[PDB]
Structure formats: structure tokens, C-alpha cells
Amino acid sequence: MIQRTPKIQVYSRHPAENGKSNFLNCYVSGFHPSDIEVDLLKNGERIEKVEHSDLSFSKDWSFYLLYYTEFTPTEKDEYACRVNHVTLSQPKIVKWDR
Numbered sequence: 001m002i003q004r005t006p007k008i009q010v011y012s013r014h015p016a017e018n019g020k021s022n023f024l025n026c027y028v029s030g031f032h033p034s035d036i037e038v039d040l041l042k043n044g045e046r047i048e049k050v051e052h053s054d055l056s057f058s059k060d061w062s063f064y065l066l067y068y069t070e071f072t073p074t075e076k077d078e079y080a081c082r083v084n085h086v087t088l089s090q091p092k093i094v095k096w097d098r
């Protein structure tokens with residue numbers, strides 16, 4: 001058996017074909033086992049509608065998840081990604097910078 005704690009990165013991107021659109025992204029990387037729970041949060045509340053959840057693996061024991069959706073951030077709102085995995089004794093919450 002092998003188990004590996006996910007690396008978690010939270011960031012925003014504008015698709016170049018539609019620059020007015022903005023996406024909030026949580027990239028959860030290099031984890032094992034694949035069992036996982038991942039949410040985007042707005043002001044502590046789970047965002048229910050997340051349009052994209054893309055899972056892949058490299059080696060059989062290394063998984064990668066890109067979890068993202070369109071959003072409209074204001075200066076006041078706080079966004080975060082919350083991840084639960086067997087390697088994390090408590091949920092890990094990573095704040096979006098900006």
C-alpha cells in the first residue's frame with residue numbers, strides 16, 4: 001500500500017476566448033488513495049454548482065483533480081477549497097488569495 005497527501009492550489013483563470021469570464025480553480029494533486037472529498041467555498045458555505053471536476057492519474061498510485069467553476073468574485077467575498085482525504089486528520093481548507 002501507499003498513501004500520499006494531496007497538494008492543494010487555489011487560483012483564478014480567465015479563458016482567453018472569453019476574458020470576461022472568471023473561473024475559480026482547486027487543483028488537488030499527487031494523492032493516493034483516490035478516495036477524496038473536495039468543495040469550493042464562498043464565505044464558508046459550500047458552492048453547490050461546480051461545473052467541472054476532472055480526474056486523472058499518472059502512475060497507478062498518483063491522482064490529480066482539477067475542480068473548477070465560473071464565478072464573480074468581489075473584493076469582500078472570501079473563497080476557499082476544502083479537502084477531506086484519509087491522509088488529512090482534519091479537513092484542509094486552503095484560502096483563495098485575491
Ligand code: NA
Pocket residue numbers: 084085086087088089090091
Ligand atoms: Na480525513
